[PDB]
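Predict the structure of Tyrosine-protein kinase SYK.
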Amino acid sequence: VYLDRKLLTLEDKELGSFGTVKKGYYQMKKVVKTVAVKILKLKDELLAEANVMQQLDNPYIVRMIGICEAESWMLVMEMAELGPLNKYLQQNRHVKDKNIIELVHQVSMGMKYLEESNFVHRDLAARNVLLVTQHYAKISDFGLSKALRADENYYKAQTHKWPVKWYAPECINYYKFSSKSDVWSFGVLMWEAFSYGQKPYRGMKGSEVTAMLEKGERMGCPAGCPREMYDLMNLCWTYDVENRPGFAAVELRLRNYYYDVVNHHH
Ligand SMILES: CNC(=O)c1nn(C)c2ccc(Nc3nccc(-n4cc(N[C@@H]5CCCNC5)c(C)n4)n3)cc12
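Done. Here is the predicted structure for Tyrosine-protein kinase SYK.
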């Protein structure tokens, strides 16, 4: 868990700005491993984040190498070279629809795993999906994640910043976060991905988003998004928590649609 700072080499220029994300190298038992390092500018939050990542083991979740306490506290992770999904899609506007389905399906597999593991992500957004390659996505950013109690299917937040545009109505109304509220966020993530990394609910305040949803209104179908994928976004945006599907049902819908698109392409 606790890494050796002399086996860590950090790059001077940051990748992005709880502080900063930098590229580095970690000397392993034989090979050198390229890493992404979250550097704090908060300590207990970083340790809790690390504690969540250490418990997860799935191909569609970012692997934590360890933590290091040096000049600042550091969370060292396996590098996903292509960076955040929203930025990548904004920069690569010609990624095919089949490829977007492939990536969102991978996110749904990682989330099916998280749901099975009884962890709630609480910040599932396209900025929190990282690309290993153009065909391999991993979920990142476990800073708000919670391990659910053995006796409850939700985490109750004590005092409300929150990414409100990705939050289900029960998060807003009752401060209750479950794998079903992660499904709602996944619906917004799908909308972002099929919109090539555009921000959801453009030009609206959080209170205006809440008023829109309460009226039963939902974002429109993005340009070129298949009807089946839009129907799935709408199903993730089921107001009633009990009627909303879980990740097992969402992943199955995506898996079947993806292989329909794969075999039709052949
Ligand atoms: C901000 N810019 C970047 O992250 C970024 N820019 N570029 C050009 C990159 C290239 C590769 C990676 N590769 C990586 N591989 C593994 C883990 C990470 N992580 C990133 C975050 N946070 C940022 C910040 C909060 C929102 N989400 C992402 C966490 C927690 N892990 N990044 C990250 C980036």
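The first helix runs from residue 43 to 55.
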